[PDB]
C-alpha cells in the first residue's frame, strides 16, 4: 500500500498538470506545440509506462506558474506523513536543500531560476527528446508517467523538474 500512495500521487499530479494548463493557460489537446516531444526514453525502466500528451499553449510563464500550481497542490493534499518523504526526493533528484515546511518555496526558486535560464528558454529545437535515469514500478502495477507537453522550452523545463521529483520517488 506504500507504492499505491506514490502512484496515486503521480496520477493526481498528471491530472492537476493537464488541468491547470487549460484552466490557467489557454492550453488545448489540439493547440499547436512550438516544440514537439519526439521521444521519451528511460535509462533504467523497471515498470514505468511512458506517455507523451501534448497540452500546448503559447504563454510559457503561465505554463510555468501553472505547473508550479499543480505541484504545490498535489503536495499539501498529501499526508504530512507522506509530505515528509519529499525533502529526500529533492536532494536525491536536484542535489538541493531539503525541509518539509519550506520545500514548495525551494522548487519555486529552482524553476524560477533554471527554467528561466537562457540556455533553457532559448533552446527551441522543434523536435526535442526527454530522457530520465531510473524509473520504477510496483511488482504487479506499472507507474504511469505522462510527459505532458507545453510547446515552449520554459514549460517543458518545469515539467521535467517535476518528472525528476516524481521518478525520484518511484525509488520507494
Amino acid at each position, epitope marked *: 500500500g506504500a507504492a499505491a500512495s506514490i502512484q496515486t500521487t503521480v496520477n493526481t499530479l498528471s491530472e492537476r498538470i493537464s488541468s491547470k494548463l487549460e484552466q490557467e493557460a489557454n492550453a488545448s489537446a489540439q493547440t499547436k506545440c512550438d516544440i514537439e516531444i519526439g521521444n521519451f526514453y528511460i535509462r533504467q525502466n523497471h515498470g514505468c509506462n511512458i506517455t507523451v500528451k501534448n497540452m500546448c499553449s503559447a504563454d510559457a510563464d503561465a505554463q510555468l506558474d501553472a505547473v508550479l500550481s499543480a505541484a504545490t497542490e498535489t503536495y499539501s493534499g498529501l499526508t504530512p506523513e507522506q509530505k515528509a518523504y519529499v525533502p529526500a526526493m529533492f536532494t*536525491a*533528484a*536536484l542535489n538541493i536543500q531539503t525541509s518539509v515546511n519550506t520545500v514548495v518555496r525551494d522548487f519555486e526558486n529552482y524553476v524560477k531560476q533554471t527554467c528561466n535560464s537562457s*540556455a533553457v528558454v*532559448d533552446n527551441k529545437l522543434k*523536435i526535442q*527528446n526527454v*530522457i530520465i535515469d531510473e524509473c520504477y514500478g510496483a511488482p504487479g502495477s506499472p507507474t504511469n508517467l505522462e510527459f505532458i507537453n507545453t510547446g515552449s522550452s520554459k514549460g*517543458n523545463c518545469a515539467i521535467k523538474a517535476l518528472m525528476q521529483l516524481t521518478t525520484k520517488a518511484t525509488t520507494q
Partner: nanobody
Amino acid sequence: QVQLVESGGGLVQAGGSLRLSCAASGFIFHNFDMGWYRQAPGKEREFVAAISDNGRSTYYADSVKGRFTISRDNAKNTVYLQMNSLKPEDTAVYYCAVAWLSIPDLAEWYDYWGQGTQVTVSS
C-alpha cells in the same frame, strides 16, 4: 564514465572561421540531442546551437544565426560547431552539452557538460 571532450578553439582574427569539435564517450550518443553553449567572462552561460539526436533538426541563438552551424557525426560520436565571421563578442569558453530535457539526472547535470574550449576572436 560519461565524458564529453571539446577541442578546436584558439585565436582567430575577426571575420575568421573555426571548426569546433566535441568527442563523446560514455553513452549511446545517437540517442542524444546535443547543444553548443558558451560562457564569457562576467556573462552567464548562453545557448548557441542545438542538434537533434539524428541531426535533422537544428536551432541557433539569434546572435549567431547565419554565422554558426552545428552538426554531428553519429559514427564518430562527435558534434561540430562551424564558426564563421567571428566577432570579438564571440570570445568565450564553449561547451557541448546535452540538451536539458534530454539530461538523465538534474542533480549530476555536470556529467553531461564538457569542460570547454576557449575562443578569442581579436580586432
